[PDB]
């Protein structure tokens, strides 16, 4: 039961289901103490069973209990666990993650196969703690708190922090992904080249494995944090290291379109 | 029906009222039992509606006040041809009511809204998914507090063990409680004026080291 931005309150439906259950339980106890006839006690016990069923798995038996003035069934525990919106598929087999971004992609013909164009501001936000550490190592900031307070305002950003960010991302790689992720090559590892502008630059040869074109497609970027994750990405997930299809064994990163035309 | 309680709940509370009526009925008055029963049944039903219909429970008298406010606002909207102002409702309520009181009463009467309220025409998003968590500290805040503790220890190491311990004991960094000057003096065996003097000189050394290194300034927010 939480107070939102404007001081209003928002609460779970489990609270209303529990209130139903407790009201009916206390009323049953009071009816038993006062020696009610068997018809009243029977109705109350049946309502108590209905309330327990509503709490555990609403809509399972009988009409689903709804909030007043609403046809929306209350969300029970079973509804929380199962379904595409259920706990398993939404918060266990897949999560929203930190150190990730998203932007519109652009063809980067000048890129090498192991490279991708990454906007400056996206990289500044993605590697922000590494950039704070590098700004503390160099004389750009007294400590990490001052470096963050400096990065907070965009007009306080000077040009030395861009060189520091260049130093931070050295050797490291990022993960590019495009939905739908139909096979394991929907995510690939690329060395990032910092670029001005707000677009991600993608190598042409991998556009077939991502099924990506440039009619408005967007991609997501992720930063592997550990030395272990970085090694996994650079060795096993690097774009230049996966040149053949795991399905057919044939080449996947192969000439196409303009390249074939010119040759 | 339609007051916040299901039909069967109203039936059961009315049965409670009927039990009360059976226990209080006097047949000598020659009144049929339905007469005396109806009063108790309506009483129990209205009491239950007033007691249980709200997630945030509100006392019965305040519920009566809010319902009277609603009825008055509806009368004013039927006579004015538009929704009334706070001041017009305060006028129609009589003495003791101003616009501020009407506003505060309407604010108190606000019921909460479901976290699972749908967003969009697809079943894919909920309202509570757009609600942040303001209680648990962010990683930035925890890192900042840790760095503050570490810089505090770095600055206290530039004192002697005794004059840093005096400050640690007086400001609560040790044991969590702030000791009085008498207690720190009795712990170091010295006089309370003596411990106050060494506390002041330790604070002086800390202020000097701060003006020199400018380390703890950024943590002032």
């Amino acid at each position: 039961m939480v107070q939102v931005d404007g001081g209003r309150f928002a609460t779970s439906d489990l609270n209303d289901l529990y209130r139903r259950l407790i009201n009916r339980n206390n009323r049953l106890k009071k009816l038993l103490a006062q020696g009610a006839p068997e018809i009243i006690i029977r109705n109350e016990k049946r309502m108590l069973q209905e309330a327990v069923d509503a709490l555990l798995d609403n809509g399972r038996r009988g009409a689903p209990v709804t909030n007043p003035g609403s046809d929306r069934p209350l969300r029970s525990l079973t509804d929380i666990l199962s379904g595409k919106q259920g706990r398993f598929r939404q918060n266990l087999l897949g999560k929203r993650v930190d150190y990730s971004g998203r932007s519109v992609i652009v063809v980067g013909p000048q890129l090498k196969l192991h490279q991708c164009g990454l906007p400056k501001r996206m990289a500044l936000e993605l590697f922000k703690p590494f950039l704070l550490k590098k700004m503390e190592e160099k004389g750009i900031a007294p400590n990490v708190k001052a470096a963050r307070r400096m990065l907070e305002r965009q007009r306080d950003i000077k040009d030395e922090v861009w060189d520091a960010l260049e130093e931070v991302i050295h050797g490291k790689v990022v993960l590019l992904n495009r939905a739908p992720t139909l096979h394991r090559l929907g995510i690939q590892a690329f060395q990032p080249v910092l670029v001005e502008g707000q677009s991600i630059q993608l190598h042409p040869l991998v556009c077939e494995a991502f099924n990506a074109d440039f009619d408005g497609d967007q991609m997501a970027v992720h930063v592997p944090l550990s030395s272990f994750a970085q090694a996994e990405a650079r060795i096993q997930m690097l774009s230049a290291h996966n040149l053949l299809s795991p399905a057919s064994g044939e080449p996947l990163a192969k000439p196409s379109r303009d390249i074939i035309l010119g040759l | 029906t339609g007051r916040g309680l299901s039909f069967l709940d109203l039936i059961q509370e009315g049965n409670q009222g009927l039990i009360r009526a059976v226990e209080k009925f006097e047949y000598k008055r020659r009144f049929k039992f339905s007469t005396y029963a109806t009063w108790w049944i309506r009483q129990a039903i209205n009491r239950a509606i007033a007691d249980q219909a709200r997630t945030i429970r509100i006392p019965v008298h305040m519920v009566e006040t809010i319902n009277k406010l609603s009825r008055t606002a509806r009368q004013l909207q039927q006579e004015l041809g538009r929704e009334p102002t706070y001041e017009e409702i305060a006028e129609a309520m009589g003495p003791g009511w101003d616009a501020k009181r009407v506003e505060e009463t309407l604010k108190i009467a606000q019921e909460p809204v479901s976290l699972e309220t749908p967003i969009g025409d697809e079943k894919d998003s909920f309202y509570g998914d757009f609600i942040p968590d303001e209680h648990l500290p962010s990683p930035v805040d925890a890192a900042t507090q840790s760095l503050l503790s570490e810089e505090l220890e770095k600055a206290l190491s530039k004192l002697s063990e005794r004059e840093a311990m005096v400050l640690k004991l007086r400001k609560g960094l040790i044991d969590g409680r702030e000791h009085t000057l008498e207690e720190v003096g009795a712990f170091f065996g010295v006089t309370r004026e003596r411990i106050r003097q060494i506390e002041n000189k330790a604070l002086r050394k800390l202020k000097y080291h701060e003006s020199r290194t400018r380390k703890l300034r950024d943590f002032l927010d």
């Binding site: 018809i39 109705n43 | 039909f7």
Partner: peptide, 14 residues
């Protein structure tokens, strides 16, 4: 299956 119909049937037996 309808609790209210069942309760009304039970009420109608007295």
């Amino acid at each position: 299956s309808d609790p209210v119909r069942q309760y009304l049937h039970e009420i109608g037996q007295v």
